[PDB]
Design a protein around this ligand. Sequence first.
Ligand SMILES: [Mg+2]
Length: 155
Amino acid sequence: KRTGKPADTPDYKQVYLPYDAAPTERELERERRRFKQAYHGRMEHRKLVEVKEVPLNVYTYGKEGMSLPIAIFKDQKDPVIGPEWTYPGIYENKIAAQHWYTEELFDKESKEAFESPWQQQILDNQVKRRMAKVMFRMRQVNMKAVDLFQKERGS
RNA sequence: AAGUAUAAUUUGUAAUUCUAAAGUAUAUUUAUAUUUUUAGUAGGUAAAUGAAAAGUAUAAAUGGAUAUAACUUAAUAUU
Ligand SMILES: [Mg+2]
């Protein structure tokens, strides 16, 4: 929908340099060439997908000294991305913020091995999302019979 | 993620339908009784090629040689 979408797109401003050692442009290519391909899905169906809009500079993309164009107020200065360790639980998220297929989390819990302590909570919230899916129709089937997938799909 | 989604309704929302529990009672059987596993009496036996001691006469007054075609005939009675 065309509602709640930016009708303009300002640019990035790079405030301070995250490094003092300037890269050779071959380093700027060899890191970028590493980025253009990424993995999608984590299970038996897992497919490499090529990534659109891979930045010119990998070293300076998100990790410090860049001011985001997410500013809102008048006196709001574009927020400068700080150092990594000052952002809480980021290293802990990198472990656990990833697509977790249910089967796969489950097997980890059974083997009593979790990459992060949090993947308990990652599992518990998946189950609750699934069962909700079950609990919704059971409030909908009550009021009127709703038959799953008998209608013609598309045109 | 701090249970927001496979519906109905609406131009699009919103509001309102709805928001998961379910057991015992009635959902124990009949048997006896009836149409065909038997004897007793008759009565050769296990199923289809008739019987005449009276003309086959010495026999002459009470001898049954009464032994029997359902479609073509002949005559007669009917409806
Ligand atoms: Mg109500």
